[PDB]
Amino acid sequence: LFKIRMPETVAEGTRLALRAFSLVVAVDEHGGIGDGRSIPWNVPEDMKFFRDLTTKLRGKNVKPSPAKRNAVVMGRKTWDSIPPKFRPLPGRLNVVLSSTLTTQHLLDGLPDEEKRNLHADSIVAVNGGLEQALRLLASPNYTPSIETVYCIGGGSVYAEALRPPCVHLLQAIYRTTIRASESSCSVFFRVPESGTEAAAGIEWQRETISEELTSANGNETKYYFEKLIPRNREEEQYLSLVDRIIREGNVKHDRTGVGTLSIFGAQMRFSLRNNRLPLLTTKRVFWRGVCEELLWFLRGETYAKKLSDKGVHIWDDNGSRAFLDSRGLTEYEEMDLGPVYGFQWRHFGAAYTHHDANYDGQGVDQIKAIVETLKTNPDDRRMLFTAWNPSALPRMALPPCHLLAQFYVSNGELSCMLYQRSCDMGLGVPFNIASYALLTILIAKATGLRPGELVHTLGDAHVYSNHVEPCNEQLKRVPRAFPYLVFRREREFLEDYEEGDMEVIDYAPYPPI
Amino acid sequence: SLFKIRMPETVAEGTRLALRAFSLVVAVDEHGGIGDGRSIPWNVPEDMKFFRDLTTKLRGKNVKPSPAKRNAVVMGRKTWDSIPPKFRPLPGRLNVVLSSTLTTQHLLDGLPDEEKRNLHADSIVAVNGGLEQALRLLASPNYTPSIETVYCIGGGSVYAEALRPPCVHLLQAIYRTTIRASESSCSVFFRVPESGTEAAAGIEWQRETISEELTSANGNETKYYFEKLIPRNREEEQYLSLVDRIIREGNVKHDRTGVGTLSIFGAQMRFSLRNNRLPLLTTKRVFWRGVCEELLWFLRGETYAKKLSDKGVHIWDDNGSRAFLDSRGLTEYEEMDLGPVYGFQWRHFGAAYTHHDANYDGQGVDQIKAIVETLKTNPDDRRMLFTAWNPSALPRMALPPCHLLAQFYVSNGELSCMLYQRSCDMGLGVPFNIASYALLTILIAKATGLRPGELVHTLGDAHVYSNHVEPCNEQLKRVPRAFPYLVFRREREFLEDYEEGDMEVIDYAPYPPI
Ligand SMILES: NC(=O)C1=CN([C@@H]2O[C@H](COP(=O)(O)OP(=O)(O)OC[C@H]3O[C@@H](n4cnc5c(N)ncnc54)[C@H](OP(=O)(O)O)[C@@H]3O)[C@@H](O)[C@H]2O)C=CC1
Ligand SMILES: NC(=O)C1=CN([C@@H]2O[C@H](COP(=O)(O)OP(=O)(O)OC[C@H]3O[C@@H](n4cnc5c(N)ncnc54)[C@H](OP(=O)(O)O)[C@@H]3O)[C@@H](O)[C@H]2O)C=CC1
Ligand SMILES: CC1(C)N=C(N)N=C(N)N1OCCCOc1cccc(Cl)c1Cl
Ligand SMILES: CC1(C)N=C(N)N=C(N)N1OCCCOc1cccc(Cl)c1Cl
Ligand SMILES: O=c1ccn([C@H]2C[C@H](O)[C@@H](COP(=O)(O)O)O2)c(=O)[nH]1
Ligand SMILES: O=c1ccn([C@H]2C[C@H](O)[C@@H](COP(=O)(O)O)O2)c(=O)[nH]1
């Protein structure tokens, strides 16, 4: 009615084409991985590392299961190299690439029968390459049930993962180096030199490298582990700005003595193409809160309790009876924030009485109008909305911070720019980037467009003196690949979307600082 | 009175020009020699002529020098001495002589006859100091803006002072004639510092022009050539390269009209407003007078475009005409009555609108006044911004705001400003917008005891019109020159009372029409 009806192109725009994945490999001092039939060395330490890496789930105490586990992709020749007693690999979805062998054909080559019924759901053959597997793994019954997809081998498989379109989906490369006294390899693994067309535009950098370890294989073979990740220039934008703000920002102390380092005016860009979701990796982002709050904004809500009831307490300090009163909002029921954010978005200028009254047709519905223009006249330059209403400011628990957004369209993609007057680089900005990335994504799905990019304009960009110590540490971390957002379900109206309708996959942020 | 914004006692001390900008003319041989300490070792009539025309002529055409409008030349006392009394002072120019031994009267007494010193009294002034003191004198009201361009004309000591801070930062151009002198044996030299060296002080001298090798009719067939160097203007380059990127990578788009553009989404540029600098682009003259009249017009919260048209500023005629207004369904508006646009929102945000001449005193939110007050008591407040983008009022506006948001920031007594423009015509709009908001920051600063800092410009739909691509590509050939400056010849009791004539842009030398 006064809600926004999603078109019939809802799911296509954000349908995941290929699932992201990681790569594991052991290599000798020459890049050798095998002679074509087997691995010419025996370092049990690497075997354990491989077992644990591809088996373990990130969550604490979560044991693999059809509901939640990792998958492993391997060339058919690699499947045959594994002794039948060790097949299929336990706790992981075994995926085999074969133009001939079928799923059951693999189940038959196993010793037991009272076992093949257990592995029925643990093995799958794909008549195609890694790409074909990545597409199969991206479908609904594998995503997000499968937490991480690991390419575990086959010279040809590694080779395919290192060329487009697969390399663009490689989140990390775990490479073990074995200083073997022997050199009997004919199948290798090499990462294209930077700048080369073979590199694709990716620059692999070391996140970690172990000390030189000595194997207990009887030969004291020397080896070491190493982790490579694709340079995330977008997150680097953010780290660079924080660092600049800390090293050259103006120093100020407010009426309480609260210190800040700041600059005025900055801009960042983030891609939202192909399901990409710019959730910073150097410090985990409270995605569940971001999502619940945005949906909350879009519905034009003003009652913070709906948030705190879901475990999202970001608005508690500003919706308390105490804070409301310090604002002169003595008559607002507690947690009633007044005509903030979402209300102005959907009912700009309308008079406010109390949260959750019906406001149909009151004020200007900026979001609805932009939905219409985006669909009929995409070149329009008036497609923006604001929560900055000087007339209503006094009635707000707080004045809007991210206060303006403008949309733009080119090549069938929706782009958005956010204007933020005050930016806490440490605790706010990452949250804000997430919030508006999602907004652009949702608006794109509601207008038959595809997610383009988020442009973030910052006014007062700052770092609180306190946060300086923590931030300097976070700045040492090399950013990781960004995660992806998928929709497990769609809705008839934009206002009916729920946090559970969507899921962030392949998000592997660094631990707390 | 209370509806207006009263200027403080510091209104003039803050935008007060400390030093006047200048240019430098010099003739050096191939080893950087300029003289033996007493005179110039060579005789090249053509250079003497170049010097004469360059320092005497005023910009434009058929404008002869006059006491109320001419250039000035600054020279050391030894250079003044080297000129034969029969040529002193240099006609058509204010001759400024640096000296700690001779007064202005002593300079006059040193002239040949009385008929010469009597007439030539308003053409000579001696300053008891160096080039810097001279530039400060020149910055005073009786010399600025009356003096169009200041030229440093010599004395090794003077050239040296012009090439080191604080003076080099005010050096807008270097006109250097190189004499290919057969034999050279000077004792006084000159030489510009290379890019990247400390002595250059971050300045990257660019060669705007260089003549072909010329032969002097001095009798010795002496070879010589001319050069004009300019301090690289990175700021204007932000704009040129953005235009160039739009043309090469921009997406094609069309207006409701059907007119095509090339555009990119989201960009940002910065401009310093320190020491009276005003970012008026040089690769294409900007209509300053219209910029100023309109900006003041916004500040008063005006909505009647005829106030501008009656001042030879017709930038609003096309959108305030009976025809355009009817096309917008605003038939109850008298012609040129734009509706609650721009300034109306700035000073009376949210106020109901009827007609441009109704009394709106105290109606709606006066965002400008509120910001001026926070700026003077709580400078680090992070909510200092105003907006003309009022969803409620849009339908009643001739057209929705382009530059729709502005936020201020303070640091070290300096005022910075951030403009947010949703749509940006790079060719004809953007240069104008940068100028107006640079002006705004300066006026707000003057109104709050602050000094102009920086202007940050955020661009939304940044585009170049199809019918401008070619002419723009051309403009892109030009190497931008140094920006001009802004000075106020007088002040006002209230912000709303300032007039375009209260201020003047000086040392603005844009390239001629493409
Ligand atoms: N050092 C290490 O960490 C590792 C080393 N290895 C070593 O690597 C060597 C194996 O490498 P390699 O010969 O490349 O073999 P792979 O293990 O990659 O197997 C290749 C086979 O996978 C299938 N396949 C690959 N691409 C496709 C496709 N696009 N469509 C259909 N089927 C496809 C084919 O099966 P089919 O023939 O049925 O059509 C194919 O012949 C061995 O020596 C093994 O020991 C293996 C893993 C790890
Ligand atoms: N090639 C060219 O284009 C030019 C060459 N020349 C050559 O340059 C040589 C002259 O150079 P140079 O000896 O450096 O002389 P200058 O022409 O620079 O004169 C220096 C004199 O100017 C005055 N002065 C300079 N700075 C100050 C100050 N800070 N405070 C007070 N007075 C100051 C002093 O006057 P006082 O002593 O009275 O106190 C001083 O001795 C000559 O040979 C002349 O021919 C000159 C102009 C141009
Ligand atoms: C593990 C190993 C080399 N080590 C690392 N670091 N990465 C891999 N991808 N590997 O290869 C896994 C495929 C080959 O697996 C086997 C080959 C022979 C016996 C057994 Cl039990 C297994 Cl699992
Ligand atoms: C002129 C000259 C070198 N030429 C150029 N291009 N630049 C200068 N700065 N000059 O020096 C001017 C100071 C000395 O001027 C004279 C010296 C002797 C006689 C006469 Cl009539 C004059 Cl104006
Ligand atoms: O979405 C938001 C909301 C707030 N902040 C930060 C900026 C400031 O550090 C503080 C709000 O204080 P003021 O700017 O209003 O003073 O919260 C953000 O970064 N993002
Ligand atoms: O201050 C201004 C006013 C207008 N424009 C330009 C931008 C657009 O090219 C056109 C206005 O059209 P819309 O964006 O409203 O469609 O005028 C500017 O660049 N600056």
- What is the DSSP secondary-structure string of A457-494? EEEEEEEEGGGHHHHHHHTTSPP----EEEES---SBG
* Residue B152, marked binder: no
Which approach determined this entry?
X-ray
Ligand 1: list residues with CB < 6 Å: A 25-26, 33-39, 75-78, 81, 97-101, 128-129, 153-157, 187
Report domain B1-234's class.
alpha beta
Q: From the CA of A76, how far away is ligand 5's center (Å)? A: 55
DSSP string, B409-444: EEETTEEEEEEEEEEEETTTTHHHHHHHHHHHHHHH
CA neighbours closer than 13 Å in the CB half-sphere of residue B88: 22
CA separation for the pair B194, B204 (Å, rounded): 7
How many CB atoms lie under 10 A from the CB of residue B459? 26
Strands B147-152 and B70-76, bridge-based pairing: parallel
Q: Return the exposure string of A228-242: e unless at least 16 CB atoms fall within 10 Å of the residue's CB, then b.
A: bbbbbebbebbbebb
Distance CA B135, CA B270 (A): 28
* Cα separation values, A193 from A119, A190, A205, B404, Å: 41, 9, 12, 48
B94 touches ligand 4 (CB under 6 Å): no
Task: For residue A259, report the phi and psi dihedrals to the nearest 5 degrees.
Answer: -80, 150
Task: Decide if B409 touches A, using CB distance below 8 A.
Answer: yes
CA distance A180 to A41: 7
SS3 of residue A26 by DSSP:
strand
**B-contacting residues in A 341-360 (Cβ below 8 Å):** 348-349
**Phi/psi at A327 (5° precision):** -95, -5
The response to whether A77 counts as a known ligand-binding position is: yes
Indicate the domain borders of chain B: 1-234, 235-514
Resolution in angstrom units: 2.4
**Cα maximum dimension of chain A:** 82
Give yes or no for a contact between B400 and B436, defined as CB atoms under 8 angstroms apart: no
**A266 neighbourhood in chain B, CB within 8 Å:** 268
User: Using CA atoms, how far apart are residues B152 and B157, in angstroms rounded to an integer?
Assistant: 11
Instruction: Indicate the length of chain B as a whole number.
Output: 514
Taking the CA of residue B176 as reference, the ligand 4 atom at the shortest distance is 6
Amino acid letter, residue A207: E
Q: Indicate which atom in ligand 6 lies nearest the CA of residue B403.
A: 1
Q: Beta-strand (E) ranges in A122-168?
A: 123-126, 146-151
DSSP B87: G
How far apart are the CA of B290 and the nearest CA of chain A, in angstroms? 25
Q: Cis peptide leading into A44, omega within 30 of 0?
A: no
Q: Do B423 and A379 count as a contact with CB atoms less than 8 A apart?
A: no
Where helices occur in B269-341 by DSSP H, the ranges are 288-299, 306-309, 317-320, 322-327
Crossing angle for the helix pair A429-445 and A233-248, to the nearest 10 degrees: 150
Closest CA of chain A from B414, distance in Å = 12
- The phi-psi region of residue A335 (left if phi > 0; otherwise alpha if psi is between -120 and 50; otherwise beta) is left
Q: d(Cα B333, Cα B397) in Å, to the nearest integer?
A: 10
B364: left (phi over 0), alpha (psi -120 to 50) or beta: left
Give the mutation candidate from A237, A250, A256, A264 for the B interface (greatest B CB count, under 10 A): A264
Token pair, residue B61, equals: 């055409």
Contact A443, A371 (CB under 8 A): yes
Using CB atoms, which residue from B253, B391, B405 is nearest to A348?
B391
How far apart (Å, rounded) are the C-alpha atoms in residues B471 and A413?
30
CA of A207 to the centre of ligand 3 (A): 22
Angle (CA) A280-A469-A206 rounded to 5° is: 50
N- to C-terminal Cα separation, chain A? 47
Q: Give the three-class secondary structure for B197.
A: coil
**Nearest Cα residue in chain A from B351:** A391
Break chain B down into helix, strand, coil percent, rounded to 5: 30, 25, 45
| CB distance B423 to B461 below 8 Å | yes
Q: What distance in Å separates the CA atoms of residue B302 and residue B438, rounded to the nearest whole number?
A: 20
* Contact between residue B506 and residue B488 where contact means Cβ atoms under 8 Å apart: no
End-to-end CA distance of chain B: 47
Pull the structure tokens for residue A201.
């535009």
Q: Which helix (H) or strand (E) holds A368?
A: helix A366-376
* E strand or H helix at A222: strand A222-230
One DSSP character per residue, A225-256 reads EEEEEE--HHHHHHHHHHHHHHHHPEEEE-TT
CATH 3.30.572.10 fits A234-513, yes or no: yes
One-letter amino acid identity for B202?
A: G
Task: Label residue B497 exposed, middle or buried (CB < 10 Å: 0-12, 13-18, 19+).
Answer: middle
Helices and strands of chain A, counted as H and E runs:
13, 19
Task: For residue B462, give how far its alpha carbon lies from the nearest alpha carbon of chain A (Å).
Answer: 10
Return the ∠ at Cα A121 (arms to A115 and A122), rounded to 5°: 75
CA-angle at B223, arms to B218 and B228, nearest 5°: 110
Tokens of B278: 């005003």
Q: What does the alpha-carbon distance between residue B214 and residue B248 come to, in Å, rounded to a whole number?
A: 40
Residues 6 or more apart whose CB falls under 8 angstroms from that of B182 comprise B220, B222
Q: Which CATH architecture has domain A1-233?
A: 3-Layer(aba) Sandwich (3.40)
Q: Class of B235-514 per CATH? A: alpha beta
Distance CA A132, CA A149 (A): 13
B25 lines ligand 4 (CB under 6 A): yes
B113 lines ligand 4 (CB under 6 A): no
Atom of ligand 6 nearest to the CA of B426: 19
Closest Cα to atom 16 of ligand 4: B83
Structure tokens, B45: 């009539």
The Cα A494–Cα A367 span in angstroms is 11
